[PDB]
C-alpha cells in the first residue's frame, strides 16, 4: 500500500523527465545567419547560413543598436525573423 | 488501493508511450554535426554536415563534459536537437 | 441609395481583403536577388541569392527607373516576383 | 448621393489595381536554363540554372530553328518544358 | 464466346491503362545522369546531374549493349529508374 | 473463336510485360554513400553522396565484417539504413 504510493511517485517522476526529453527534442531550432545590411524601413537583410540572403523582420525585443553588419543572428526557421543577436 | 493500482497502470501506460516517443526522436537516422559554440542559456550552436548552422536544444542525457567546441554530434533530423555526442 | 451604401460596404470589404492579400504577398521574409536583364514584354530575369535564375513578374508599384541590370531586388519566396528594388 | 456614386467609382478602381497586383505577385515564374543538345526525337536536353540537366519537352509555339546549343531558355517550373527562347 | 469477347474488352482496357501509366513514367521531364557501374544483379549505379549517386532499376526496353560505364542516361525523376540511354 | 483465344493470350502477355515495366520504373532507388566510421554501438556513420554524414542502422543480413571505412554502401532512401555493401 505504501509500495504502490512509492511506485506512483517514481513513475510520476520518470514520466516528468521523459516529457521533458520529448519537449527538448521536439523544440524547433533557430537558423544562424549574419546581418548584411539594415534597411531604411527597419527590415534587415540577412545572409542565411543556408546560403541565400533574405529581407527579414526583427523581434520587437531586440535592441536594434546591436543589429549591425557582421552581427551573428538567430532566425525563426519558417519566417526567418531575427529572434536573437548572438555573441 | 484499487485506485492506486489503477493509477499505477495508467502511469505505466503513459510511461510506455513516453519511452516509445523518446526512442523514435532519438532513433537513427541522425544527422552528423559539429558543436560550434555554447550559449549562456545552454542552447548550442552546431554546424550540420548538411552545411548550415543552427541553434539547437540538447537531450538532457548528454554528458555536458563532452559537449564542447569541435565535438562531433548526432542531430535529430527534423529539429536538429543534439541527441548524442559522438567520438 | 440604400443600394449605393450597400455597394460601398461591399466594395470596402472587398478592398480590405485585397489589401491584406497584397500585404501578405509583399511581406517579409523576401529572398534577395539581382536583376540580370529586362525583357521586351516587361518580365525580368533575376538571379536569386539561392543560385538559379528566373523570369519573373514585378509589382506594379516598382519605380521602373531603378529597375535595371545589377539592381538588387527583393523577391516573393513562392513566385519570385519582384516586390521592391533595394539599394 | 453623387458622393456615394463617386466612392463606388474609386473603390472599383482601387480594387481593380489591387487584384492586378495580386495577379502579378501570384503568377508563376519560369526557370532559366541553357540548351545543351537536341535529341533525335525532338526532346531537348537543357542545363537548368538550378544545376542539373534535364530532358524536356518544347512548346509547340517555339521556332525549333532557334533551339540550338547555348541558347538561353525559359522553362515551366514544374514540367521544365521550354516555354520561351530568350535573347 | 460472349465471354471471350468480354475478356478481350477487359484485357484491352487493362492494356490501355497500363500503356498510359508506362508513358507517364517514361515521359519528360527526365533527369540526366551517367552510368557509373553495373551490378551483378543487373541494377545500375548512376550519378545524377543533381549530384548524388544511386542504385537504380532500368526499363526492360533498354538496349543492354549501350548500357555501360560513362553512358549518358535519362532518369525518371521520382525513382531515378533508367528510362533511356542517351548519346 | 480460336482468334479470340489467341488475342486473349497475347493481351495477357503484353499486359504482363507492361506491369513489369511499371514495377521496374516505380521501384525505389537506393542512395549511395561511403562508410566513414563504425560506432561502439553498431551504428555506422555514413557519408551520403547527397553531401551530409549520417548515423544509420544496418541491415541484419549484412556481414558486418564488410563494413569498414571507405566501403561503398547503398542506403534506403527514407531511413538511410545500409541495405547493401557494394564492390
Short mmCIF file of N, CA and C in Angstrom, two decimals, chain A residues 31 46 48 50 54-58 74-83, chain C residues 29-30 77:
data_model
loop_
_atom_site.label_atom_id
_atom_site.label_comp_id
_atom_site.label_asym_id
_atom_site.label_seq_id
_atom_site.Cartn_x
_atom_site.Cartn_y
_atom_site.Cartn_z
N UNK A 31 17.94 29.31 -36.94
CA UNK A 31 18.82 29.20 -38.05
C UNK A 31 19.79 30.33 -37.96
N UNK A 46 19.65 39.74 -44.18
CA UNK A 46 20.48 38.73 -43.52
C UNK A 46 21.02 37.74 -44.54
N UNK A 48 21.70 34.11 -44.77
CA UNK A 48 21.50 32.83 -44.07
C UNK A 48 22.70 31.92 -44.18
N UNK A 50 22.27 28.87 -44.51
CA UNK A 50 21.79 28.02 -45.64
C UNK A 50 22.22 28.52 -47.03
N UNK A 54 18.21 37.19 -47.27
CA UNK A 54 16.80 37.46 -47.13
C UNK A 54 16.54 38.82 -46.48
N UNK A 55 15.37 39.38 -46.77
CA UNK A 55 14.88 40.56 -46.12
C UNK A 55 13.95 40.08 -45.07
N UNK A 56 14.25 40.36 -43.82
CA UNK A 56 13.50 39.74 -42.74
C UNK A 56 13.07 40.77 -41.72
N UNK A 57 12.08 40.39 -40.92
CA UNK A 57 11.70 41.17 -39.79
C UNK A 57 12.59 40.87 -38.57
N UNK A 58 12.46 41.71 -37.55
CA UNK A 58 13.23 41.57 -36.32
C UNK A 58 12.29 41.55 -35.14
N UNK A 74 20.22 34.82 -34.99
CA UNK A 74 19.48 33.56 -34.98
C UNK A 74 18.02 33.83 -35.48
N UNK A 75 17.57 33.03 -36.45
CA UNK A 75 16.36 33.30 -37.19
C UNK A 75 15.33 32.23 -36.94
N UNK A 76 14.07 32.63 -36.80
CA UNK A 76 12.98 31.66 -36.82
C UNK A 76 13.08 30.85 -38.13
N UNK A 77 12.85 29.56 -38.05
CA UNK A 77 13.21 28.69 -39.17
C UNK A 77 12.22 28.84 -40.32
N UNK A 78 10.94 29.09 -40.04
CA UNK A 78 9.92 29.32 -41.08
C UNK A 78 9.87 30.77 -41.58
N UNK A 79 9.76 31.75 -40.68
CA UNK A 79 9.63 33.17 -41.10
C UNK A 79 10.97 33.86 -41.28
N UNK A 80 12.02 33.27 -40.77
CA UNK A 80 13.35 33.88 -40.87
C UNK A 80 13.49 35.25 -40.11
N UNK A 81 12.54 35.54 -39.22
CA UNK A 81 12.64 36.73 -38.34
C UNK A 81 13.80 36.57 -37.38
N UNK A 82 14.53 37.68 -37.17
CA UNK A 82 15.62 37.74 -36.18
C UNK A 82 15.09 37.61 -34.75
N UNK A 83 15.44 36.51 -34.09
CA UNK A 83 14.94 36.21 -32.76
C UNK A 83 16.00 36.62 -31.67
N UNK C 29 9.40 37.23 -44.84
CA UNK C 29 10.73 37.21 -45.47
C UNK C 29 10.68 37.22 -47.01
N UNK C 30 11.65 37.90 -47.59
CA UNK C 30 11.73 38.01 -49.02
C UNK C 30 13.12 37.58 -49.38
N UNK C 77 8.89 34.68 -52.08
CA UNK C 77 9.64 33.42 -51.98
C UNK C 77 9.00 32.30 -52.81
#
